[PDB]
Symmetry: C2
Subunit: 482 residues, 2 copies
């Protein structure tokens, strides 16, 4: 093709690739829900209101578990790639109420949202990352419709060969001694998704260019590996050694936490399909026959939307769609039910540490050592459930790891409850005895605008721990500065 | 063939079936251990001693968890079918120290160990079940080598067609409206193993012929199903209503327990293979049909798997098995630890002398139930011989629920004492309740031995008595 190697416009590909383009346009369907997933952007913590506000399979405790982090404001089920920027610009996680108009998040937040990344990294280099996210938000900076996730994110425009635009994934391949050119078509059919559907973190300024994205894979891809990995890479001590990494300090328990984000690749690669050489594209980009021929479907969505499960039957030819669906649900039902329980246990763990920190009664002689261990268990337990929760398959990508991970999560949280309780000489035991939902009610609603209202914050024991934000008018709506 | 319809002597088949016979003799290999299984009968709770006594992947807490039940005496890894009787007659679970020479276990214990069952049931009818196990133990009653599990257990001797000898399995098929003659060859290739590789219980006399074996499947095959099933079928109260079934009362916690035994069928049937119509025989009796029924992991090339998984190497298949087993084994040990803590919490609460909570009795009743349920759940996984592989998701989900139940028991019992016992339960459970490495019927005769461990100390000393049975020999 004659399309520019750096083309950011999806529309530039339509004329020469009408079939793949029209298929990619189906990502605009945001009306169908499946049993646990789907394309309606409901609030992931809302199991009270019906669709599309909430959902029967929402996670009630999310806001509590992320108290003090932007995810306490908004976090929704995902839509197709065509809406990435729209959703990016609607999310309350990015500050829209600051006078200077700053989002209070790094420009790195654009990293997995647009092909424009190539041009921005070319222009700004290492310095792009820590610029404010909202410095690239106006209509003259990005076209939400045409420059959202598109063809140039996975294809070399000139040859249409599979190509990585991703700096952090390229960093990883470089670090691990891998080489794109020597990789199989098969491996590439997974790696293009691994540019974005992974857990990541923002570089601390003591260790490299501020906010440069990193995939924390050096210790391995499992939750335990990541937990071990995150014992380093944080801020340096007066003595220069990087301490443990910290995404935020929980506003209730004051525990230094790690946030997990969509670890699809890490979860799937050692699962029953991933370990066998099956690629993301095999299930999510099935060959389909449309208008005279066989194309790679570019509708990247839930395979459960198709009652016949065609995308599975090129390998599971002897199975009916219903059978395959039931085997998916066989795992998801179990994973979802246990996840909710690991989440309650995590909340109780946070509450135990919070109660112990506030405990005025006589303490155990080894109080400080007990609390230090309790905090670490809160952090570890949460990293583990989040690793499963944040992952979009609800256990199907890797059933055994999901369930094993949830079980370890709960064990860690329970250990935090036990240690913190012992630290107070069991003074806080009675309180921790009830329904955790009574002591720490799930936070259904919480937004940047609401956090401006003291009388709102008082309505829940945990929101009560947040500071009131300055009374302020909304300054950004979508791409309009106001 | 001319072979008699209830021929019990395996050797009667050697002549017309040398190939299958020699293949079945391969079950005599009892030397190889795999990563988690194998054919060396090591003591399943012993992770201290060398093979063939212990193993690095043993379950340290078993004796504690079965305190008050024969399984506290001996429980070993399994050997091939050819040794069923030998192992049956060596086990300390059956009493060998009684003057009258009784084993103190029902003859039903023979049910899944010999074809002679057909003749015995024909001779005694339902009176057979409750007779003492040792009434059929002498050489003149059974040939340990020729009449152990054999050809007649799965084959109609005359035609060699697949056939069920099992009363309990036939009972089930009859109850559930199923019919052998209308069943697929495929389904039969699983059912012959389901005659024995399942969870079962002994009928309480109030509800049917004493000790008749039943497969508790009416509520479904899952652990929750069985737990619900066992809310009934126990002893009747004055109004004739059967109470909850109980296998034994835990000697420490005094909780009425349910024992799970080798639920291979129940576990595997809704797993990734079982749900897909794959049979036990497909993996364990690879194509003649190999009659070596053992661990498929003994074969580095995993031949038995590659007629379906042709594009995979043996190493790959092995790693995928281990991917599940290692996770299942690690979590099991933890569920077991939590179960011990739950028993100990209920025990400490029962003994508690301090201020009780006003709703003590209701809290304890729920705590006990949770001990019982938690244990049924881990045992369902532990007792099963695949260490998670037959059904990875159910195994792990089941272990997680088990732990949840046990933790609930700890919480309820603790709350019942107004938290007076909380400090006592805070440490390493292995310190407060040390694993019982060694315990036998002979040792339980010695008070000084019993004092060596806080839980064996809760057992009564058995009468000083000489051993009366060894193998099939009286003494
Ligand atoms: C790749 C390494 C990414 C980084 C860096 C950021 N995001 Fe992301 N984002 C990514 C994926 C693969 C997905 C879909 C999967 C999922 O579970 O969300 C998303 C999704 C979003 C969304 C929509 C869903 C929601 O969270 O409500 C938003 C609003 C979003 N992302 C914003 C966002 C922000 C603020 C980031 C910086 C902190 C950020 N993304 C980084 C991939 C990646
Ligand atoms: C990653 C998220 C992709 C996006 C964005 C786009 N494409 Fe794609 N494409 C992707 C994969 C993994 C594959 C399979 C390649 C293989 O060798 O198996 C493809 C394939 C194509 C092809 C080749 C013909 C076919 O198999 O259909 C074409 C012509 C193509 N894709 C076009 C295309 C267009 C026009 C896109 C923007 C609208 C586009 N792709 C985005 C991965 C991804
Ligand atoms: C960054 C450049 C990405 C690449 C490369 C891939 N994905 Fe993605 N995906 C990304 C984001 C930010 C989002 C959220 C968009 C939003 O507006 O919420 C998604 C979403 C998905 C979904 C859900 C779509 C739905 O209908 O619900 C799926 C199923 C999905 N992504 C899959 C997927 C696959 C298979 C990819 C490789 C071929 C892939 N994505 C690449 C970000 C990016
Ligand atoms: C087949 C065995 C699959 C492979 C290989 C991959 N995915 Fe998957 N994915 C699959 C199923 C059956 C589901 C559940 C769908 C449902 O409705 O429950 C998923 C889920 C996802 C999602 C979430 C979809 C949504 O509605 O937002 C995403 C984002 C996703 N998968 C991405 C993804 C990636 C990155 C993969 C390679 C690393 C991958 N999938 C492989 C089936 C299969
Ligand atoms: C080939 C590229 C495949 C596609 C497309 C799908 N599956 Fe698959 N599946 C495949 C392999 C190689 C395996 C492991 C067995 C092996 O030979 O190594 C599987 C396994 C499963 C299972 C069993 C595991 C479980 O979770 O119970 C299920 C239920 C399953 N696959 C379902 C499934 C679905 C829903 C798919 C479409 C979305 C699908 N498979 C596609 C190979 C391939
Ligand atoms: C079928 C319904 C059976 C009943 C009734 C009894 N046993 Fe069993 N036994 C059965 C199987 C499928 C196996 C091998 C699988 C396993 O996990 O053990 C066994 C094994 C034994 C063994 C050897 C292993 C051991 O426990 O050390 C012994 C000593 C044994 N069985 C004895 C025994 C007793 C005493 C029974 C009555 C209480 C009994 N069996 C019943 C199948 C079945
Ligand atoms: C169950 C535990 C069995 C024992 C004990 C014996 N056999 Fe078997 N046999 C069994 C199965 C599940 C099958 C497969 C049947 C099918 O239709 O697929 C067989 C098969 C045979 C055959 C048929 C030829 C073959 O496929 O090998 C023969 C001749 C045979 N078995 C003989 C045989 C002998 C001699 C046994 C005692 C030593 C014996 N079987 C025991 C199940 C079981
Ligand atoms: C009762 C009549 C049984 C039938 C029918 C089946 N099995 Fe069995 N099996 C049974 C017992 C009592 C034992 C333990 C024997 C001992 O001395 O410990 C076993 C053992 C096994 C083993 C383990 C053998 C090893 O090498 O470790 C396996 C793998 C096994 N059994 C499988 C199996 C299969 C596949 C069956 C159906 C075809 C089957 N058994 C039937 C009791 C009985
Ligand atoms: C293939 C997918 C299998 C099916 C179908 C059945 N079994 Fe299985 N079994 C399989 C594996 C890979 C293992 C683990 C072996 C190891 O060494 O870890 C097992 C294990 C068993 C055992 C224990 C073996 C031992 O050493 O004692 C038994 C007794 C057993 N399996 C019995 C059994 C039954 C009754 C089945 C049908 C219901 C069955 N297996 C199916 C592989 C597969
Ligand atoms: C046909 C009769 C099979 C034999 C023999 C074995 N497997 Fe299998 N396997 C089979 C099916 C139908 C499936 C589910 C996929 C589907 O099409 O529905 C599987 C799945 C697996 C998996 C993935 C699940 C997991 O536990 O990770 C594995 C790892 C697997 N099978 C391994 C395996 C082994 C070790 C076998 C020999 C002992 C074996 N399979 C035999 C079909 C059949
Ligand atoms: Ca979605
Ligand atoms: Ca992260
Ligand atoms: Ca064995
Ligand atoms: Ca039982
Ligand atoms: Cl954020
Ligand atoms: Cl090991
Ligand atoms: Cl017993
Ligand atoms: Cl008190
Ligand atoms: Zn080991
Ligand atoms: Zn009191």
């Amino acid at each position: 093709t004659g399309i520019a190697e750096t083309e950011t416009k999806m529309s530039a590909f339509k004329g020469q690739f009408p079939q793949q383009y029209a298929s990619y346009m189906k990502n605009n369907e945001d009306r169908i829900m499946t049993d646990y997933k789907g394309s309606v952007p409901y609030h992931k913590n809302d199991n009270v209101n019906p669709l599309p506000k909430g959902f029967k399979h929402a996670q009630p405790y999310l806001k509590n578990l992320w108290l003090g982090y932007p995810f306490m404001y908004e976090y929704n089920e995902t839509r197709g790639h065509t809406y990435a920027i729209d959703d990016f610009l609607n999310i309350d996680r990015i500050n829209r109420f600051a006078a200077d108009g700053k989002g209070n998040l790094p420009a790195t937040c654009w990293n997995c949202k647009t092909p424009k990344m190539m041009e921005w990294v070319s222009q700004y280099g290492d310095k792009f990352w820590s610029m404010d996210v909202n410095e690239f938000r106006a209509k003259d900076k990005i076209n939400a419709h045409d420059e959202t996730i598109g063809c140039a994110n996975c294809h070399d425009p000139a040859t249409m060969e599979l190509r990585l635009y991703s700096e952090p994934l390229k960093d990883w391949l470089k670090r691990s001694g891998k080489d794109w050119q020597k990789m199989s078509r098969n491996e590439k059919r997974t790696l293009v998704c691994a540019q974005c559907h992974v857990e990541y973190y923002f570089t601390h300024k003591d260790n490299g260019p501020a906010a440069k994205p990193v995939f924390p894979w050096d210790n391995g891809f499992n939750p335990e590996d990541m937990y071990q990995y995150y014992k380093g890479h944080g801020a340096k001590g007066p003595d220069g050694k990087p301490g443990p990494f910290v995404d935020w300090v929980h506003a209730a328990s004051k525990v230094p936490m790690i946030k997990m984000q969509h670890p699809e690749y890490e979860t799937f690669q050692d699962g029953p399909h991933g370990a066998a050489g099956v690629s993301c594209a095999d299930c999510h980009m099935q060959y389909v026959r449309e208008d005279g021929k066989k194309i790679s479907s570019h509708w990247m969505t839930s395979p459960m939307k198709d009652p016949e499960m065609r995308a599975c039957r090129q390998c599971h030819a002897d199975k009916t769609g219903e059978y395959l669906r039931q085997r998916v649900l066989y795992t998801q039902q179990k994973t979802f039910d246990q996840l909710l329980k690991a989440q309650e246990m995590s909340v109780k763990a946070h509450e135990a540490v919070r109660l112990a920190n506030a405990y005025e009664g006589h303490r155990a002689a080894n109080y400080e050592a007990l609390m230090a261990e309790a905090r670490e268990m809160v952090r570890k337990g949460q990293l583990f459930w989040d690793y499963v929760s944040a992952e979009n398959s609800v256990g199907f990508h890797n059933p055994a790891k999901a369930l094993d991970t949830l079980m370890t999560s709960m064990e860690c949280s329970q250990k935090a409850v036990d240690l913190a309780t012992e630290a107070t000489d069991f003074g806080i035991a009675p309180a921790l005895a009830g329904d955790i939902k009574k002591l720490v009610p799930p936070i259904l609603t919480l937004s940047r605008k609401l956090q401006q209202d003291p009388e709102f914050l008082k309505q829940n024991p945990w929101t009560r721990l947040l500071p009131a934000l300055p009374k302020a008018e909304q300054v950004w709506e979508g791409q309009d500065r106001a």
